[PDB]
């Protein structure tokens, strides 16, 4: 058919990106906002985080495909910077644009970049200082990594709970939290909130006065497939070989229910000795009223509807083995939660599996009556969880609020890449994308992304001072004192995911449809 | 206006926010007297009258007295109050003020 | 309607580029001439910034605006007109880039002012004194003509250039308001510019054997009529009635015949000797028997001269404006060490020379007799206008954009304001500097930047002025290259640069009004 070539294909590329990018620039720091997102489903989503906006919907361009790619990098590889990663490239693109606006090769200006990124990486090592993984040292990173991602006040209460979650570790040291994430969204009088609740929490537990709400000594038979069949890890018919056989099973189906409670009432006394130790069958389907009562009446807690995750985290948490049957099991495999506690909050029971024998799994209780509030608060958590988890995995920490970038753009002082000056321009180009965080904020916040940053620049050129645009009012300060300190996992990776995709479009002279 | 004046998003939002925090602080201060009875129809009716005022153009006192009766007298206390303490059989005939509270 | 906010700006600065563009090489040895069959519609040929401006019909207001302020500096410089146009748009973009980034143009204009002075302050730092000698006179005259014409034609004229300016230093006159008397010869050949330390007239009138070679020059330069109107006049033109126009003419030739006899003794009083040459010059015609009998007296006589000539001959020859053919003092009637009526082509051109004042001094260009002959003329006059600045100031500096980088090296690095708000305008200000060397070189050769870094690094090394070699497109030290700006021009430019680029940056609107 047709194609596009020369700078015509290039113009479509570089324009579509920076046409999409500044749309995303509306949000960063706390002075960013929460961008309304409605995908084909019709749900409104408000996110200052990149991955949501990037991976849901896009104004469709050939560039819109690569942007989520390196967006699939930042959140994956780090989780802090998804908001920050986008704003870097087009600021660098408009720079390089100038050089090819002058006219030049996108190839020679390509070679003018990555060294500067490699430089800044060096410079990032240089300017940063390794910092404590201490809880309160994390806070200044925690708020910021959250706050660069999501708005302050949410990030502020998240600063507490996220650190409380990432400090909950057994010293399983990760960039993210897999197990520390157990999210319980609850309809509540609090529309945006997250409650930290330790230990594995079960999707539900069953009510009955004889059924113990408090199990401190738990022998947990994980229970999935219901009372209604004998020794069955899956519910299926023992009958229905003809038309009238349909009636016979349900006539004999109530038998297995009593057979099954018979197993559990004895398996308690088998394993637990007397009934003082609550024998825990968490029945991940509904417990039939008779055995619901008769397990209650025997002291067994028959818990209604845990999760497959609450089955696997149980295998983790309780240090015991799960099962898909209620069958009598050897007392060994039965899980032990140092606390099995059914917790009715609102009308809903959330059964704590606590004293996790592997407390890498904790639980967050999310709050809202309105899902649009309840979704958004859930969203701000986890992108900041792994962000602040990049705080406590990192003994190195990089000070935020433009402290380190003026330590690059100025210390990139040119003719160090003197050869063609294309690097001297490319590093200059790269130097100019560094300050987008000092830019976007003094942009979003008061004064000017420029007239404040000149102080930042100046005040950094002053006394080598760590200095930066406020995340809040957009005025100069000392960013080291403020404590705004970016994850050491962000900075390096934040650079890589930029210049690698910033390299591609330059070498792309061609597009065809 | 502050958009025409040029004030940013969170800025003025922080304006109403810390002020609605400031306002929620004053709301208990601006409580003017009080009243209630876990039983009495008439006294309770007046609040139930005046709350449904916005929500009713019709008889203010009559639906005041019914729902006050209803809400109260369905209960041994009405120190406790719940979602459905009152349901309705919508029935025509006679008057609209012929309406009666039957627990 | 109106154009407000950004629209009062863009169209102005958008117009300021293609304008800037076409003449980006009107300039330097890289400079390229342009024509017009368009603006004034005629067959026209021109190289200079301000001069190509006026020739066009420029309906965009800004295009007319610089023409004014450029003409000011155009006067003394004659080059750098094309230059100053280039840095302003180079400045306007950066300020636009700020307002594109968004920012306030007046605080941006506020950002120029220290930088301008700082650069001005730098301009006396970078001004290096090469006092007036033919070398500096050569190298500035050529670099101007290397700008305006061929380096060939530059060095061809660079002789004629320094020719007259030697006697203007005899005048000790830092400017040339004379010796700028130029004669344009009918020939096939452009390049021939003849120094005559006196004047030249195309005259020697209608008669030969007047001793057109006059060794003892005694010059009567007169407007008296040895010839005059035959046309019908009463009130000065054709009168309603015919006859009263007639009575005037019969006193014409008689008046002319008498003045012949008046020149006889005017030859005898003045000279009495044909061996002492006498020269008449009439601003009007002269009848044949006048010149014929004036040839009998040992007199050459020149009918129909010009006011400059009369005065220039009154000056150069120590001559006269004197009005009479009656017996007059020879000492009044001026003198030239040699006088000859020279012929190239059809007309007989009197070369009057070794004149009492070497004051009005002919540089006689031959030429194709074209707009080309017109073309080769205008430049050398400006080649002077370069070197007069060199005569003006004691400080003559390497050209080809040698000063530009060092300023950007001087200015930006430390903030000259130590303040970003102005540094904004300063960062805008010190980018304007670089375009001319980097645009011409990249036009003439290797790029802005890779050439910049070479001019930069060597400045960054030395701080010495390495200019551009436009013979390549690479930097060299424009000291040795000979391309030499004076301090005057570069002084003058920022003034003409900034003040026009400021008030237009601060236009708050534009409106069709009445």
UniProtKB/Swiss-Prot annotation, chain A:
Domain of life of the source: Eukaryota
Alphabetical keyword list: Acetylation, ATP-binding, Chaperone, Cytoplasm, Hydrolase, Isopeptide bond, Nucleotide-binding, Phosphoprotein, Ubl conjugation
Record's keyword annotation contains 4Fe-4S: no
Name this polypeptide is given: T-complex protein 1 subunit zeta
Molecular function in Gene Ontology: ATP binding; ATP hydrolysis activity; ATP-dependent protein folding chaperone; protein folding chaperone; RNA binding; unfolded protein binding; WD40-repeat domain binding
Location(s) in or outside the cell: Cytoplasm
Binding-site residues for Mg(2+), renumbered to this chain: 80
Modified residue annotations for N6-acetyllysine: 189, 277, 355, 367, 378
Enzyme nomenclature, EC number: 3.6.1.-
Disorder named in the UniProt entry: De novo genetic variants in nearly every subunit of the TRiC complex, including CCT6A, have been found in individuals with a broad spectrum of brain malformations, and clinical phenotypes ranging from mild to severe epilepsy, developmental delay, intellectual disability, ataxia, and other features of cerebral malfunction.
Coiled-coil regions listed in the entry: none
Covalent link location (Glycyl lysine isopeptide (Lys-Gly) (interchain with G-Cter in SUMO2)): 241
Catalytic reaction equation(s): ATP + H2O = ADP + phosphate + H(+)
NCBIfam families: chap_CCT_zeta (TIGR02347), thermosome_beta (NF041083)
UniProt keyword Phosphoprotein, yes or no: yes
Function: Component of the chaperonin-containing T-complex (TRiC), a molecular chaperone complex that assists the folding of actin, tubulin and other proteins upon ATP hydrolysis. The TRiC complex mediates the folding of WRAP53/TCAB1, thereby regulating telomere maintenance.
UniProt xrefs under Pfam families: Cpn60_TCP1 (PF00118)
Residues recorded with modification Phosphoserine: 195
From Swiss-Prot, chain B:
Residue numbers of Phosphoserine PTMs: 46, 97
Localization: Cytoplasm; Cytoplasm, Cytoskeleton, Microtubule organizing center, Centrosome; Cytoplasm, Cytoskeleton, Cilium basal body
UniProt: ATP binding residues: 54-55
Binding site for ADP: 53-55
Entry function: Component of the chaperonin-containing T-complex (TRiC), a molecular chaperone complex that assists the folding of actin, tubulin and other proteins upon ATP hydrolysis. The TRiC complex mediates the folding of WRAP53/TCAB1, thereby regulating telomere maintenance. As part of the TRiC complex may play a role in the assembly of BBSome, a complex involved in ciliogenesis regulating transports vesicles to the cilia.
Disease: De novo genetic variants in nearly every subunit of the TRiC complex, including CCT8, have been found in individuals with a broad spectrum of brain malformations, and clinical phenotypes ranging from mild to severe epilepsy, developmental delay, intellectual disability, ataxia, and other features of cerebral malfunction.
Family per similarity comment: Belongs to the TCP-1 chaperonin family.
Self-association state and partner proteins as the record states: Component of the chaperonin-containing T-complex (TRiC), a hexadecamer composed of two identical back-to-back stacked rings enclosing a protein folding chamber. Each ring is made up of eight different subunits: TCP1/CCT1, CCT2, CCT3, CCT4, CCT5, CCT6A/CCT6, CCT7, CCT8. Interacts with PACRG. Interacts with DNAAF4. Interacts with synaptic plasticity regulator PANTS.
Name this protein carries in UniProt: T-complex protein 1 subunit theta
Residues of the full protein shown: 117 to 219 of 548
Curated annotation (Swiss-Prot), chain C:
Primary localisation category: cytoplasm
Compartment(s) where it occurs, according to its Swiss-Prot or TrEMBL record: Cytoplasm
Positions that bind ATP: 28, 80-82, 400-401, 485, 490
Entry binding sites for ADP: 28, 80-83, 147-148, 400, 485
Signal peptide location: none
Function: Component of the chaperonin-containing T-complex (TRiC), a molecular chaperone complex that assists the folding of actin, tubulin and other proteins upon ATP hydrolysis. The TRiC complex mediates the folding of WRAP53/TCAB1, thereby regulating telomere maintenance.
CDD domains: TCP1_zeta (cd03342)
Family (UniProt): Belongs to the TCP-1 chaperonin family.
Disorder: De novo genetic variants in nearly every subunit of the TRiC complex, including CCT6A, have been found in individuals with a broad spectrum of brain malformations, and clinical phenotypes ranging from mild to severe epilepsy, developmental delay, intellectual disability, ataxia, and other features of cerebral malfunction.
Modification N6-acetyllysine, positions: 188, 276, 354, 366, 377
Cross-link (Glycyl lysine isopeptide (Lys-Gly) (interchain with G-Cter in SUMO2)): 240
Keyword Phosphoprotein: yes
Positions of post-translational Phosphoserine modification: 194
Any one Gene Ontology molecular-function term assigned to this protein's record: unfolded protein binding
GO (cellular component) term, any one: cytosol
Source taxonomy: Eukaryota, Metazoa, Chordata, Craniata, Vertebrata
Full protein name: T-complex protein 1 subunit zeta
Catalytic reaction list: ATP + H2O = ADP + phosphate + H(+)
């Amino acid at each position: 058919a047709e194609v596009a070539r020369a700078q015509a294909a290039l113009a479509v590329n570089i324009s579509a990106a920076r046409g999409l990018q500044d749309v995303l620039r509306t949000n960063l720091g706390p002075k960013g906002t929460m961008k309304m997102l409605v995908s084909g489903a019709g749900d409104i989503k408000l996110t200052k985080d990149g991955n949501v906006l990037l991976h849901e919907m896009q104004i469709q361009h050939p560039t819109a495909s690569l942007i989520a790619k390196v967006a699939t990098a930042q959140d994956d590889i780090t989780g802090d910077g998804t908001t920050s990663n986008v704003l870097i490239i087009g600021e660098l693109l408009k720079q390089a644009d100038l050089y090819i606006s002058e006219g030049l090769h996108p190839r020679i200006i390509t070679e003018g970049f990555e060294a500067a990124k490699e430089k800044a990486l060096q410079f990032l090592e240089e300017v940063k200082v390794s910092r404590e993984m201490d809880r309160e040292t994390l806070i200044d990173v925690a708020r910021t990594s959250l706050r660069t991602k999501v708005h302050a006040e949410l990030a502020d209460v998240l600063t507490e709970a996220v650190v409380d979650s990432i400090l909950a570790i057994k010293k399983q040291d990760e960039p993210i939290d897999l197990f520390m994430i157990e999210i319980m969204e609850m309809k509540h009088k609090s529309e945006t909130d997250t409650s930290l609740i330790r230990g594995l929490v079960l999707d539900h537990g069953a009510r009955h006065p004889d059924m113990k709400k408090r199990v401190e000594d738990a022998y947990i038979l994980t229970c999935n497939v219901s009372l209604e069949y004998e020794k069955t890890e899956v519910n299926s018919g023992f009958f229905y070989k003809s038309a009238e056989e349909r009636e016979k099973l349900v006539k004999a189906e109530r038998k297995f229910i009593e057979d099954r409670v018979k197993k559990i009432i004895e398996l308690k006394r088998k394993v637990c000795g007397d009934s003082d130790k609550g024998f825990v069958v968490i029945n991940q389907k509904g417990i039939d009223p008779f055995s619901l009562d008769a397990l209650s009446k025997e002291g067994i807690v028959a818990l209604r509807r845990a999760k497959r995750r609450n089955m696997e985290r149980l295998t983790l948490a309780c240090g015991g083995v799960a099962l898909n049957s209620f069958d009598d099991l050897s007392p060994d495999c039965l899980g032990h939660a140092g606390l099995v506690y059914e917790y009715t909050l609102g009308e809903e029971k959330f059964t704590f599996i606590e004293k996790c024998n592997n407390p890498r799994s904790v639980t967050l209780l999310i709050k809202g009556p309105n899902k649009h509030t309840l979704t958004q608060i859930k969203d701000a958590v986890r992108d900041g969880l792994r962000a602040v988890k990049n705080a406590i995995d990192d003994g190195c920490v990089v000070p935020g609020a433009g402290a380190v970038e003026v330590a690059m753009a100025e210390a990139l002082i040119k003719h160090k890449p003197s050869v063609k000056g294309r690097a001297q321009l490319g590093v200059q180009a790269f130097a100019d994308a560094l300050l987008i965080i000092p830019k976007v904020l003094a942009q979003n916040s008061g004064f000017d992304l420029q007239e404040t940053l000149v102080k930042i620049q100046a005040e950094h050129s002053e006394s080598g001072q760590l200095v930066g645009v406020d995340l809040n009012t957009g005025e100069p300060m000392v960013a080291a004192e403020v404590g705004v300190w970016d994850n050491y996992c962000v900075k390096k990776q934040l650079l890589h995911s930029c210049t690698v995709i910033a390299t591609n479009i330059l070498l792309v002279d061609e597009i065809m449809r | 206006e502050l958009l025409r004046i040029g004030l940013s998003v969170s800025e003025v939002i922080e304006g109403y926010e810390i002020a609605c925090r400031k306002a929620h602080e004053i709301l208990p201060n601006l409580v003017c007297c009080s009243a209630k009875n876990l039983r009495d129809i008439d006294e309770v009716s007046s609040l139930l009258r005046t709350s449904i005022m916005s929500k009713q153009y019709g008889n203010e006192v009559f639906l005041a007295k019914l729902i006050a009766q209803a809400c109260v007298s369905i209960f041994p206390d009405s120190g406790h109050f719940n979602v459905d303490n009152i349901r309705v059989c919508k029935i025509l005939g006679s008057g609209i003020s012929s309406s009666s509270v039957l627990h």
